[PDB]
């Protein structure tokens, strides 16, 4: 037993990380087959960031202007193109450690592991969620751009996030691996703000099921609720609406514990209206919303990769 915020094993991703340097600007890139993917702001200097014309800046770059290093091995760039907000550097050797992989665009509320990297080398791994406002609450310093978020299914790595920038209040914004930003953001040093964030209700419910499986059941009440009545209260506390699809996604956890979703909802409504009165759930004094139902199932059943 026990319950912790668990990241995917990072070995398959670590073998793909390289350093990309364009003059004084350096960040991380992802070396898959014979292509290195990286944020296009690597071609910027510090002055160019306020309002960069990326096409003009890249026309002035030759293949040799890109210094790509995989540890000790310098890699020769033999072509380059820009796709949306990512650069694609064709290199003259295919990465021998390339795993089986997919590019996916995740939905808000979904989670993934981030491999934080500087100068092409990993510093750490942690799990995070795509917030409803299309930011993530990561831990990223200057140099971390190009670090990637991913999920694993057996042997296939799904890359879903490339890091690009930090927004006010310390939240983070990036792209999918096709180079389209999550949310209404642009890779410019301009005034941009994350919008109002909400609490991912289906994830809170998954976490309360996790608590029940681990024997923390003090918050279980005896009432039930309707979906519509639940969503009236949730909305008041800045929770996302629970949909019937969400109720169905919670089905396996509900079956395991014998607690109908609408009964768990009745218990969440009381927590929201009355607080926790100094108590904790799973060691936490706030409700946690960064475990999906699949995350709970994986951790509580021990799925491996």
């Amino acid at each position: 037993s026990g319950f912790r915020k668990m990241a995917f094993p990072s070995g398959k991703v670590e073998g793909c990380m390289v350093q990309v340097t364009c003059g004084t600007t350096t960040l991380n890139g992802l070396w898959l087959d014979d292509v290195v993917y990286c944020p296009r702001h690597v071609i910027c200097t510090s002055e160019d960031m306020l309002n960069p014309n990326y096409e003009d800046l890249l026309i002035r770059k030759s293949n040799h202007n890109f210094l790509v290093q995989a540890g000790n091995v310098q890699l020769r760039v033999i072509g380059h193109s820009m796709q949306n907000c990512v650069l694609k550097l064709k290199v003259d050797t295919a990465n021998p450690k390339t795993p089986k992989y997919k590019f996916v665009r995740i939905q808000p509320g979904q989670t993934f592991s981030v491999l934080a990297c500087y100068n092409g080398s990993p510093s750490g791994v942690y799990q995070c969620a795509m917030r409803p406002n299309f930011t993530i609450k990561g831990s990223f310093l200057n140099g971390s751009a190009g670090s990637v978020g991913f999920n694993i299914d057996y042997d296939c790595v799904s890359f879903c996030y490339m890091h690009h920038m930090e927004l006010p209040t310390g939240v983070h914004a990036g792209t999918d691996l096709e180079g389209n930003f999550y949310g209404p953001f642009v890779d410019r040093q301009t005034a941009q703000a994350a919008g109002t964030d909400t609490t991912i209700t289906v994830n809170v419910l998954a976490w309360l099921y996790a608590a029940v499986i681990n024997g923390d059941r003090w918050f279980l009440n005896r009432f039930t609720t309707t979906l519509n009545d639940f969503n009236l209260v949730a909305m008041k506390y800045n929770y996302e609406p629970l949909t019937q699809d969400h109720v169905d996604i919670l089905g396996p956890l509900s079956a395991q514990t014998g607690i109908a979703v609408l009964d768990m909802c009745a218990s969440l409504k009381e927590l929201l209206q009355n607080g926790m009165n100094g108590r904790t759930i799973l060691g936490s004094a706030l409700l946690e919303d960064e475990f999906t139902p699949f995350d709970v199932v994986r951790q509580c059943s021990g799925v491996t990769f």
Partner: peptide, 8 residues
């Protein structure tokens, strides 16, 4: 404002 997280 938004800050691009490349490095020096």
């Amino acid at each position: 404002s938004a800050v691009l997280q490349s490095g020096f």
